Design a protein around this ligand. Structure first.
Ligand SMILES: [Zn+2]
Ligand SMILES: [Zn+2]
Lengths: 292, 145, 49, 70, 39
RNA sequence: ACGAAUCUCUUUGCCUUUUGGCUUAGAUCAAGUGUAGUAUCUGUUCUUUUCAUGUAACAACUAAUGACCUCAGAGGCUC
RNA sequence: ACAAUGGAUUCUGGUAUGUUCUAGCGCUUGUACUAAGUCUCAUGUACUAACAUCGAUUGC
């Protein structure tokens, strides 16, 4: 029906805070992002003096089948993305719900003209069928390489020196880094410790972490920061031979440090992926030798 | 004109091109309507259990009957059902009424010189020589009887 | 090296392997075919394994 | 960059440049692919494989020659 | 083969779902724009 | 001459890879040479374009690679 | 004693049509020796024109 068409589905947070919004209707505007088929393009601005036009990117049929708005394509209730919506319902019904989309232009147009709901769009747009699953979300919250010749590399890693105040170095050697714990999280924890925040402007610290070798190093400019990095770390572990090592403390993780006393560079950790895995396998013993 | 050209550039041409009937294809569209009417009337005489295979074979007795008509050969199929033979002879006579009357109409046009196609002069010659011999063979049988 | 696909002859040409095509779902029925779908999915994944 | 007029070419010495030789080398590998595909066929005729088999020996000898120059 | 009878005609079900073009035909130009009503 | 089951076989039923338009049968049932056009190969003519012995003394080469150190890749040293 | 004067041009025309032509990486397993191009003429061959070919007189 070209003379009887639904009103558009737009979020409240796309429309924003103001009361009256002048919206422009173009009866066959752009074509839909999803079904590649033309529709009534609505576009508007939040305020009069704004500088960003907010367009409706998809048609109302693709917006109804997913239960999303046309502008930001987030869900109409819960205001979350579709990939996260179908994952949260998957933990409640214990089965995979998923809206699947055709890669084929004759099967993008076919899938839009049917009057079904897709994915979590049966659960959402029914308020009774959505609130009880939020209650079922609440009970979930009540639960709350032996052949490698690695010996050329381990001479350059320190592994035998202590974390004292007295050496004045720029570089350090961070080992026991998990395959999680992203490179930004270690620079933010050090910069929170020194108060040298927005460090990327002045380039106060430079950090290299491999994530295969489970090891890394962080370089400082201006060596007087090195005594600030030593003195602001209180907790240390002493190996039962000696040779105390400081612990950086990312949440639930422990990262050991030794002053390198030279610049490690890239490729100190490894020059091949198969080669770097054995250095993590080399270290895992020394961590167990350091602790136990 | 140019408005049709520019919109055909921006949008492409329509996929719903329905061809009107023409002098070029009136013999083609006549047989499509003639085959559908024969295929309807036989499928309604059938008691049950007739498919796309049995409807496909019966339409070849329609083509064979019209070749026997143009040859002035009596079309008699042994074992043909008498309702279904009655249907085909009704439509072969119907097609013959159009075939003969088109030979009378086009003959009067060729005598007047009033824009007959070069193919149709060879076609009207080929029709009348079948009509002349069919009238000749019928005259032979009236003396023999 | 992967198998190359036959190139599209026209614009809306269809790769039949990528998508179930003009899928028509079996009409919803009163018989709750829920465990049957689990067993068929398990057997299908077992086949492709 | 064109080079269609230029032979394979069986002579090697005439072109001093290696970067140009980079293009000449593909000019050969492509034929290696065409004929190579032309090696297995439903008919599997001896005469067709037999000529292709000789072409393979000729190409492998050329690969030995390029390796020897290096 | 390749010269076939029709098993079914082309339906208007297929042309109804297509998108229109809006091309201007000479026989769809306006003419006889007033209807005549019987007494 | 009536087996509760399997296989093999015979006969009816089923036809299960079991003729998919049209019109003037859609039309016809025929030696060499001559001319014009395109393509390939060979011959000739015309024009254009691609280079430069022996002995003695001196200088350069056989820039790159490896290792160590400083600075935030370069600099120095040795082989 | 007669003054009378129509035309007019474009388009749809044997190779048509059809296919392949991944250089630039998506993480895991696994020092083997010297023929240029263009233009014109001639000859040879192949294809092609859906080209054409019989109009008339005699010394045994
Ligand atoms: Zn859409
Ligand atoms: Zn939105």
């Amino acid at each position: 029906d070209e003379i009887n068409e639904p009103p558009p589905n737009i979020c409240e947070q796309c429309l924003g805070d103001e009361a009256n919004i002048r919206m422009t209707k173009i009866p066959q505007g752009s074509e839909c992002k999803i079904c590649t088929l033309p529709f009534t393009l609505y576009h508007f601005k939040t305020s009069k003096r704004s500088n960003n036009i907010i367009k409706t990117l998809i048609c109302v049929r693709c917006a109804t089948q997913r239960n999303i708005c046309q502008c930001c394509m987030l869900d109409s209730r819960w205001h979350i993305p579709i990939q996260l919506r179908d994952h949260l319902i998957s933990l409640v019904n214990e089965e995979n719900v998923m809206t699947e989309e055709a890669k084929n232009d004759m099967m993008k147009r076919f899938l839009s003209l049917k009057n079904v709901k897709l994915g979590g769009a049966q659960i959402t747009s029914d308020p009774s069928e959505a609130d009880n699953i939020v209650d079922k979300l609440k009970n979930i919250l009540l639960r709350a390489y032996a052949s490698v010749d690695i010996s050329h590399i381990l001479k350059k890693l320190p592994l035998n020196e202590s974390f004292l105040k007295n050496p004045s170095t720029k570089s350090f050697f961070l080992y026991n880094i998990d395959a999680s714990i992203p490179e930004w999280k270690i620079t933010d924890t050090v910069s929170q410790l020194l108060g040298i925040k927005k460090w990327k402007d002045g380039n106060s610290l430079s950090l290299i972490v491999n994530h295969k070798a489970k090891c890394g190093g962080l370089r400082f400019q201006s060596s007087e920061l090195g005594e600030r990095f030593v003195s602001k770390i209180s907790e240390t572990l002493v190996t039962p031979k000696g040779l105390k090592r400081g612990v950086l403390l990312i949440d639930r993780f422990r990262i050991f440090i030794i002053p390198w006393s030279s610049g490690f560079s890239a490729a100190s950790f490894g020059t091949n992926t198969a080669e770097n895995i054995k250095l993590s396998l080399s270290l895992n013993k020394l961590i167990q030798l350091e602790l136990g | 004109y140019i408005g049709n050209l520019i919109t055909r550039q921006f949008e492409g041409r329509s996929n719903e091109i329905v061809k009107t009937t023409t002098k070029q294809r009136l013999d083609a569209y006549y047989d499509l309507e003639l085959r559908n009417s024969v295929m309807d009337d036989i499928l309604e005489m059938m008691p049950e259990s007739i498919r796309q295979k049995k409807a496909r074979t019966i339409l070849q007795h329609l083509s064979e009957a019209w070749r026997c008509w143009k040859a002035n050969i009596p079309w008699d199929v042994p074992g043909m059902p008498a309702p279904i033979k009655k249907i085909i002879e009704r439509y072969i006579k119907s097609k013959a009424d159009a075939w003969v009357s088109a030979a009378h109409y086009n003959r009067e046009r060729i005598k007047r010189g009033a824009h007959v196609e070069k193919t149709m002069v060879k076609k009207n010659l080929g029709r009348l020589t079948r009509l002349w011999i069919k009238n000749e063979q019928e005259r032979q049988r009236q003396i023999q009887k | 090296v992967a198998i190359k696909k036959p190139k599209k002859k026209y614009g809306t040409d269809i790769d039949y392997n990528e998508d179930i095509v003009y899928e028509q779902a079996p009409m919803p029925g009163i018989y709750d075919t829920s465990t049957e779908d689990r067993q068929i999915k398990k057997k299908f994944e077992q086949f492709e394994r | 960059k064109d080079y269609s007029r230029y032979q394979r070419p069986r002579n090697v010495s005439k072109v001093k440049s290696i970067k140009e030789a980079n293009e000449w080398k593909r000019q050969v590998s492509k034929e290696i692919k065409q004929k190579s595909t032309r090696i297995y066929d439903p008919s599997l005729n001896e005469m067709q494989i037999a000529e292709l088999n000789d072409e393979l020996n000729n190409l492998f000898k050329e690969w030995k020659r390029w390796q020897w120059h290096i | 083969t390749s010269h076939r009878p029709q098993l079914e005609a082309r339906s208007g079900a297929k042309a109804a779902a297509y998108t229109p073009t809006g091309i201007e035909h000479a026989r769809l130009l306006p003419g006889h724009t007033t209807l005549k009503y019987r007494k």
